[PDB]
Symmetry: C3
Subunit: 213 residues, 3 copies
């Protein structure tokens, strides 16, 4: 019973590694110029903020018996950090440079603030509930982009901006982590990951629809 | 007792008043029905509304919150009506983009709702369940208020009450008042707060209607 | 006894005095409005949002909601009064009937709504859950206000000009945020510390930006 839970966690984590390779396309495009035209820099920053707070949830002081999420969000957050660090010097125009760096300062300092406030002001079991609520809120907030790109596919009647390799992996990742939180009976892990399972399932199905015809 | 009877009277009153609100888009859907076009109309609000009605309906049901059944009844009959609407629309939709958009959002709302209901009964044992489904529900209902506030804005800017009918505004004012009374009697915050907030909005709406209708 | 109290009251008073500059900040606009007698160039909503914030926080400050929260009621009270004065001047000096009606309607919504949530807070909730509720609502408000100065920082970074964003205002705001942060810190009240800690961060970033 335990073994299956742990295996599920490892599987979900390793699956997340695949989703993390998705933004490499714009990063290929940076050598010429890094804006990117038609695209906006902040989401990567946003994603890292999320991964930070979730990593906070993962740590043993906040919630006991919840080790693996700290692992996936940790390696994920670090890899994101690499992205923003790469962006800011290669940023186009000083204005963009300063904006992204500033927002980064905001994220790091703020996360330090909520980490500190969380560990100081809150005693168990409240601490877990709070950091949990914030984590679930972040994960749910993130889902906006896949829903939007789904909208774009419907509008264009074409998968012109939606890759399958990324999508299938994310579907598997949500299913796995949903199983993780469900088996662990921790709601904060289960719910958003289940919602992600739904959004991904819709993604795969609609992809079948527009790839077919 | 007098409290049981009053509670039922308030709940039912809210139900009957609300019925007008649910039947309000029947004119637009009749016009949609004519010439079988959804080109001119959208279309999405029925999804946002169905999601809301389901989550409040879940709250009403006896497993999550007991003795608040009339809420389940209004939200249920309401959800069926909205579902009929999105179905009529979804087949009568003009262009594949609109039809498939509505289909997708429908799958999204229904599966999502299933997820939150199931999680609610699974992960949560009483009374926290009631508190959770309550907060989610209250959040939804308060979120709905965006549209009438918006049309109040349109009325003020256009100095016209074209998009604000008194019959509807008054009826919804009454349902809000009634359910506000309902929660108030039940001493249920989750019922009282959003409908009370709605009572304020309906009151302002009726007032602005008075101000701008007179001339 | 411990050095809890001595720092505790002084932090609140000092923070309040530092805070005073922010409430007087838009008076320049009203000076420019008073000569103008228009309000065309300016809208209009921010004074209402700010009044809403100030009432929710003031309610939190009251002994009805929270015991031992004395200074907060004071600063938020002075704030609410000033904001109400602003809204009255804007609404009377309003440019166009549309603006006048927009503002009057929203003022009605805010005052009526706040009274509503006050009543519900004191009615439905018994301690300590009440303080937790009014705290959560207050915190959401205060954090919500923070969007606008961040917006002016965005405008400054994007537009090379450091127009708007006063150093006096920025320093005063950093100081008030920091002080009330210490107040929440000593009280071990999360709802007080967290938004003000965030304010200390935003003030720090702004201070950094004056060093263009
Ligand atoms: C969006 C969330 C905002 C705060 C929501 C929390 C409201 C607190 C619930 O109030 C009352 O507390 C009782 C316990 O004392 C409950 O058993 C009862 O059902 C309820 O009437």
């Amino acid at each position: 019973y335990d073994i299956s839970c742990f295996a599920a966690g490892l599987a979900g984590n390793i699956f997340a590694l695949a989703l993390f390779l998705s933004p490499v396309t714009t990063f290929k495009r940076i050598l010429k110029a890094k804006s990117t035209e038609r695209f906006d820099g902040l989401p990567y920053l946003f994603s890292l903020l999320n991964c930070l707070i979730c990593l906070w949830y993962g740590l043993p002081w906040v919630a006991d018996g919840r080790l693996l999420v700290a692992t996936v969000n940790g390696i994920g957050a670090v890899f994101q950090l690499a992205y923003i660090c790469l962006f800011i010097f290669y940023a186009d125009s000083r204005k963009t440079r300063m904006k992204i760096i500033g927002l980064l300062v905001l994220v790091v300092c703020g996360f330090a603030l909520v980490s500190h406030a969380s560990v100081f002001f809150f005693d168990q079991p409240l601490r877990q509930q709070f950091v949990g609520a914030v984590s679930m809120a972040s994960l749910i907030s993130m889902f906006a982009s896949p829903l939007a790109v789904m909208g774009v596919v419907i509008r264009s009647e074409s998968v012109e901006f939606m890759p399958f390799y990324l999508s299938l992996s994310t579907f598997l990742m949500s299913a796995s982590f949903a199983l993780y939180g469900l088996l662990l009976r921790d709601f904060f892990i289960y719910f958003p990951n289940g919602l992600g399972l739904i959004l991904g399932a819709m993604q795969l199905a609609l992809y079948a629809y527009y790839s077919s015809n």
